[PDB]
Amino acid sequence: GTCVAARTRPVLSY
Amino acid sequence: VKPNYALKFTLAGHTKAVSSVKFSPNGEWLASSSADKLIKIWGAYDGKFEKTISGHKLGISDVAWSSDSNLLVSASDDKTLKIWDVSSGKCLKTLKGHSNYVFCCNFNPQSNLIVSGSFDESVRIWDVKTGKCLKTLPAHSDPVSAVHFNRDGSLIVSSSYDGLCRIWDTASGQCLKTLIDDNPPVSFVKFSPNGKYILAATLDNTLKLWDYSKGKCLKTYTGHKNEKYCIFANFSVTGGKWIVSGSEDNLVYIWNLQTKEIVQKLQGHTDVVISTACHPTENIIASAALENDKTIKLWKSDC
User: Where is the signal peptide, in residue numbers (chain A)?
Assistant: First the structure.
């Protein structure tokens, strides 16, 4: 669960 | 007239999506960061793996070199930045103060300062020696996607999903300019090497070259896909004058800076090319991709 980085996730615009 | 970039090496090692790749200013090394919480160091010319640097508690979104090629700074979802001694692998300082993910970072040319941008919507300026936050700028009203110093360190440019690029006086922290076009989220920005432009990416599949003094758009570059990720873009100036960027269709795009024509599309990655970097002295591009690929590629051209 710790292997997360904001740049590697898509923008959430809705 | 056109470059002939061809794939020379593929660098495999990260176990999660790569976030950022950067060449050391002296041209010897490539640093990569990843959602796997690791920084890896590779030979810039042969792609040979050198070492792994670890310490962050969550994954890393960006990494950046000091001007002497000795230090790195990294930006993490754990709300901190870390300053690293690359030669020892040691964390020298942990920069605390941001209240949300740290997304982007850079040293100034003197490399006594670090600038950072965060999901907390602020830009922070840090002292490298002490690790202290010198200034917190109320920079934007949405996540800060990129921060970069100009050639003499006197200015900082920041970008945000609020649709703005802003130019900041480093010494005073005053906002000197807000750039407004005819307001899509701005996903990346940086000064040109000669200091007279900024290059800005927006999540409407567009890159824009701005005269930030006049506050006027000079060139635009299109044909690539960019609506979801903060993809790095670059000036390539070692041979011909190109704009280089990753894309969400898994290709590296290269444009003629002056004419805005696409001159090359580099195929090889199997997922979004989140990061590209241009080597300081040689016609070499490093590219890196997201979770379904996780490899880094070195491409070389004769111009």
Answer: none
